[PDB]
Design a protein around this nucleic acid. Structure first.
Length: 86
RNA sequence: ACUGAAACUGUAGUAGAACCAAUCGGGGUCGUCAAUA
């Protein structure tokens, strides 16, 4: 497989400090923009939407350096990066 | 007159940007109603 010196499980509670809206495709007959729901119909944060939230912030932190970002979040086109480590 | 073996359809990607639940409105004030004798 991919070598992993150490795997880290990072977890905790995220609280909405303001209201939240991750959108699905949009519109449930009660709202023009409808919240994203999982296959069980439960309201959820897509891991895509949180990954890009955290990668996006990190991109601003690291002055939009592609190198260290792709070192942690993967890259489709570098010949030595591929899949994400987060 | 002899089954090929082995191989993740996967990798990167924030359903998001913009949008005022808002515009107008004195809690106000007078003669009506019935049809005959």
């Amino acid at each position: 497989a991919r070598k992993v010196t150490t795997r880290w499980k990072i977890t905790g509670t995220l609280i909405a400090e303001t209201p939240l809206h991750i959108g699905g495709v949009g519109g449930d007959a009660d709202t023009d923009l409808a919240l994203a729901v999982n296959g069980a119909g439960e309201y959820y944060v897509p891991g895509t939407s949180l990954a890009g939230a955290l990668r996006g912030w990190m991109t601003q932190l690291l002055n939009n350096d592609e190198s260290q970002i792709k070192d942690l979040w993967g890259d489709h086109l570098d010949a030595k990066r591929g899949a994400s480590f987060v």
